[model samples]
Target: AEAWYNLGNAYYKQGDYDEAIEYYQKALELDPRSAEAWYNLGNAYYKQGDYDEAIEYYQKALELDPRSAEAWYNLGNAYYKQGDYDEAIEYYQKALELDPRSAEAWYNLGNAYYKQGDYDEAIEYYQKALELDPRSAEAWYNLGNAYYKQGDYDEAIEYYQKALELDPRSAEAWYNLGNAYYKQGDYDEAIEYYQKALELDPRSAEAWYNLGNAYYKQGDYDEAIEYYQKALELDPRSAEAWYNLGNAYYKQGDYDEAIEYYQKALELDPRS
Candidate 1:
């Protein structure tokens, strides 16, 4: 049963949810009170989009072994998926109480708090997670987001830089750092970061649109139009990109092209 449960865990990590569920069920049939099997089965169900079933299995696991921190963490994730942030927090806190060194539990607790707009509490939890695992890029990135939401751009940049140092390939981190600089009116730094994000993910329409905004702020109409055009190539349905493209063309005295792009933008968003 233990071997089957371990096999299920391996499959789960590889994203083979069906195989994981099958092995977990086999493990459960052999040892009905196996908390690990029940917890892992819940994980498989959760990944398979059966959140309610996952919660039910997690509850069974907890009933069999109330001290199982993993079961509590999985229950929290199930509640979080249902948008029951309060319930999620309760289970996450329970998990943390059982295993105070669980960085993942702390991270999830931070997410639950952040969703409720409790930025300070979120930061506290994120800091706890970071203290437990200094190499956690996700914790650093989420800390950056919390700082950004609180309008602490410098702190946001610092956390973002830490995240990038850990994972330089993360385009989302670069784009978010660009947004931090853009919010501080540092257009040059914003453009530089946006360019880095673009180099990592050429299909990022939002990054291109924001890059165009940086250019427009610098009164570089041609550069702004070029980026907006690239954004449109990636996402034709972006009303903001089309509208900004029209504005850039208008600034360049191309009234006819501007009118065409404006019409397209209006078609994308009637309120535009």
Candidate 2:
């Protein structure tokens, strides 16, 4: 059982969710009361995108050991994946109560609060998380997100810069910085950050789409259409990409192509 549990942990670390689940199940069969096995099983299920099943396994683990902070944290993660922010926050808070210095739990609590539009609470929790672990790039990025949602673009940019300072490979932070600049109508700065983000994550369709928007706002219609095409190529189902492609063509006085792209966009999103 010990060997199986260790193997399960190795599999989980390797991101092999299916193999992790199988080994965790074997460990559980050998030792039914193994709270760690149940908790890890829940993590495997959560990684496999089975949030409801993950929740059940996490609850079982919690039942076996109510004071298990890891179990509570995994339960919170499962709930967060299902978009149950309130339930996620409750469990995260419980996890923090069990382990007051849990930076991860505080970070997740901040995520939940941000989803609920409680920016003040989110900021407080994020600050607490950073206090526990100053090197957490994710915490800094989330603080930037909360500040952006609160319309504090300068503060958002500062936090984003801090996150990038901590983790230079943070493509998401660069993308978010672009979003912040674009919101402030700073197309040149937005384009610069978007390009940097794209260099890090070349396959990011959303980044491509946003880059196209920044180009269009700058009256670079040809460049806008090129980026929109790249975005559509990356994600053919992107209705927004098709809509923007239509608009770009319309601006270039290509009415027929505009109509074709518009029809394609509408076909993908009938409401549009």
Candidate 3:
């Protein structure tokens, strides 16, 4: 197992996670005193989605080196994978206790808080992560989501656009960025961003529906009907889409199609 340590490191570095585990388990058996060996084994296990094995290896890594902040942080990640946000928070705190300026630990701490529906605590830690590493696009994006949850669309746009500059390809960023303008009543801006989201995520019914709403707000019933129809093609159970489509046709002075869509809307939801 000790003889396989070098081989395991090489395999792990090359992105061959399965082959790395073939060697790391052996190294763990013979090199029990080596903290890094255990850490690498944990990393390999995590890369392969073996969270239970990763948890054990990370625990062993911390046992050999109590001061290893990486081990503590990864342990938190593994615990979070198993649906224990409480335990994840505990381990992330331990990592931050060891290194107060660790943005990765701060970010994950915020994530656990976010998952637990404590948006206030999540915002605090997410802000800490940004202060420590302003270049972290994920922290910026997550902070944007928190602000959005707080109903602060203005702040959400600021945070989300900062993340967008750092990473231009996240569909969530574009989608949520579009939503900020939608909520702000800027229909033109909403349409612009929603189109960007559609470019990246073509099958998103929500984006299609939202785009239809933007056109409706601008009194363009023809364009509204086009997007609403596409939205319903993607997801047929949306009563709101049917209702909106009915309204669009009514505005266009097409009584027959309006009544047809209205009937479908009522059949789907009698109350709304």
RMSD in angstroms, all models? 3.0, 4.5, 2.9
Task: Name the weakest run of 10 consecutive residues (lDDT summed) in model 1.
Answer: 130-139
What is the per-residue lDDT of model 2 for residues 37-101, given as tens digits with 9 covering 90 to 100?
Answer: 88889889888879999999989888989999888888888888888998989988888887989
The true-versus-predicted C-alpha distance at residue 198 of model 1, in Å, is 1.3
Q: What TM-score against the true fold does each predicted structure earn?
A: 0.86, 0.73, 0.84
TM-score of 3: 0.84
Tally clashing residue pairs in candidate 3.
0
The sequence of per-residue lDDT tens digits that candidate 1 reaches over residues 85-179 is 98999999999888999888888899999998789778998998877778677788999999999998989999988899999999999999999
Clashes of 2: 0
The global Cα lDDT (0 to 1) of model 3 is 0.87
Best by TM-score: 1
Off by over 4 Å in 2: 1-83
Looking at model 2, residue 9 earns an lDDT score of: 93
Global CA lDDT of candidate 2, please?
A: 0.88
* TM-score for predicted model 1 compared with the true structure: 0.86
State which candidate has the highest lDDT.
Answer: 1
